[PDB]
């Protein structure tokens, strides 16, 4: 999660099982299901939703201007 340019929000239990909430940029959620399944032995899962927009990094922005 952090390594995907994300920013984590918190952690609660469920079916025990655990849940981890985060804001990651969508640009970094492509094909997530598969790393997630690798990183969790095919035992975890996820849901994901648009929350908001914000300033892409000054080092990303100016690559895009092509």
Partner 1 sequence: KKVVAVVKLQLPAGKATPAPPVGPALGQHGANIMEFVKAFNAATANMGDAIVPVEITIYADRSFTFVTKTPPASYLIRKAAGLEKGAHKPGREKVGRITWEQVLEIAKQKMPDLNTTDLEAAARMIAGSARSMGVEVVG
Partner RNA sequence: AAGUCUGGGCUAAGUGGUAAAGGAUGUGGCGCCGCGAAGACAGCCAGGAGGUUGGCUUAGAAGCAGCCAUCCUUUAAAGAG
Element (H, E) at 27: none
Residue 21 in the binding site for partner 1 (CB under 8 A): no
The residue among 25, 33, 34 whose CA lies nearest residue 3 is 25
Give the one residue of 8, 27, 33, 48 binding RNA; rule: CB under 7 A.
Answer: 8
Give yes or no for a contact between 6 and 27, defined as CB atoms under 8 angstroms apart.
no
* Minimum distance from residue 44 beta carbon to partner 1 (Å): 17
Residue 13 in the binding site for partner 1 (CB under 8 A): yes
Binding residues for partner 1, per CB under 8 A?
12-13, 16
């Amino acid at each position: 999660l952090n390594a995907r340019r994300g920013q984590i929000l918190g952690m609660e239990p469920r079916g025990n099982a655990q849940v981890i909430r985060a804001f990651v940029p969508l640009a970094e959620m492509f094909g997530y299901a598969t790393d997630l399944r690798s990183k969790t032995q095919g035992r975890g899962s996820f849901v994901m939703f648009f929350d908001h927009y914000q300033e892409v990094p000054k080092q990303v922005q100016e690559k895009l201007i092509k």
